[PDB]
Each structure stands twice: as C-alpha cells, then as structure tokens.
Amino acid sequence: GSHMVKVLLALTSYNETFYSDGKKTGVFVVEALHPFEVFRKKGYEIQLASETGTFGWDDHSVVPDFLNGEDKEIFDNVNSEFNVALKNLKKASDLDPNDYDIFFGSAGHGTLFDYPNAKDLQKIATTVYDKGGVVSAVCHGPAIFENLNDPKTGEPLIKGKKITGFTDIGEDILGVTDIMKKGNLLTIKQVAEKEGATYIEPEGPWDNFTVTDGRIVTGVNPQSAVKTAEDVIAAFECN
C-alpha cells in the first residue's frame, strides 16, 4: 500500500469517570494501536481523529494485562510513529472527508457517548462508504452506525447488513450493564436492532472474531482489533 490510501482512525472524545471502581473510560489503547500498526505495516497513511480533537485513555486499557510487550514499548516511546500520530490527531471537522479511503472506529466505552452523534466522523464514514471504500469498527466502535443513514439509499447504512461488536454478556462481566441502561447507551446488539441490521454474536465474549459484509467489517473486542484491521485490508483490496 501507499499514502494515497488514507485511513481515518477514529477515537472517542468522551473521557469521564465511568466504572464502579471510579476509573475513567475513553480510548481503549490497543484498539487504536493495533489497527494503526496493521495499516502502517501495510503502507497506508493513517490520520487519527476524534469529534473534538481531544481524547483520553480508558484507565482499564493501560494496565499491564492489556498493554505490554512491544505494544507498551511503542506506547512509551514518544518518538514512535503511533505517538507522532497521536500528536497529529485532528478534530474531524478540520478534515476533508473526501481525503479518506478507509474509516476505522477504535473504541472503548467512551464511544457509546459520542459516536452516535459524531456527525463529522459519521460524514467521513459515509463519504468513504459511498465511494467504494471500507467502513469498519471494533468493540463499541459500531456505535458510529447508530443514527447513520447512507446518503445513497436514504436508509441506515447498516440496514440489512451483518455486524458484530462488544457482547451483552461482556457488559455484565465489566459491571457496566446498569450504567448503560440508565444512560440510554445501546449495546451493539441494540444498535443493530435499531438500525435494522443483524447482530452476529461470537461464541464467547473474548473471542477473536470479525464479521465482513461486503465493505463493512466489524470486530468484537480488544482481542479482535488486529483481525478487524487485517479483514479491512482483505475487503478493501482485491488483493
């Protein structure tokens, strides 16, 4: 690949105390880092963006269990391409949506708050989709498809499409189900129901699992982020 292919790697802008233990949600590190690295190694240019130009990390995603090895080295090295890209992160409205050929929604629970109304990021997604690009997200990232009509059809972009994303049971295990129900924050299954999509549930909540429906590619969880990016490449190229 070349820098003529530009990936819009979307991050959530929501960064607030969220969990019962008082920790914050925000961007789940490896859901940005893994796809960044997959696309970088492929040769694409990657532009990070959030709806405000600001972000913070999900506190649960920076712990040794989830951030270790070469990932952590990249994260800690201020001169890594990943960190250069974070410094170059832009507010979505400051970008030209026509510049991008792939849209990839990184997540973390923060996305539940902003992605459904992130109209500038959403416009980049539909612009990408409507010119024959690939639109993708991992984990709660598919919240980007909530309230999102495809200009070419006048119907929800994922109407009649298959997607996956973070499981309902996963929300129980993380202790955020009640928080979500009180905030009218929709699980990805619920997003599919709202939009007339079909949610495909992985066998287990932590499985490395993706779904490709034409040029829509989704994955379940942090464990699926690499595969989601790889399967974006598969869907995007002929190769």
From Swiss-Prot:
The lineage of its organism: Eukaryota, Fungi, Dikarya, Ascomycota, Saccharomycotina. Disruption phenotype: Has a 3- to 5-fold increase in levels of intracellular methylglyoxal compared with wild-type cells grown in the same media. Changing C139S: Abolishes catalytic activity. This is Glyoxalase 3. GO terms for molecular function: glyoxalase III activity. Gene3D superfamilies: 3.40.50.880. SUPFAM superfamilies: Class I glutamine amidotransferase-like. Changing H140F: Reduces catalytic activity by 75%. It comes from Candida albicans (strain SC5314 / ATCC MYA-2876). It catalyses: methylglyoxal + H2O = (R)-lactate + H(+). Monomer. GO terms for cellular component: cytoplasm; fungal biofilm matrix; hyphal cell wall; yeast-form cell wall.
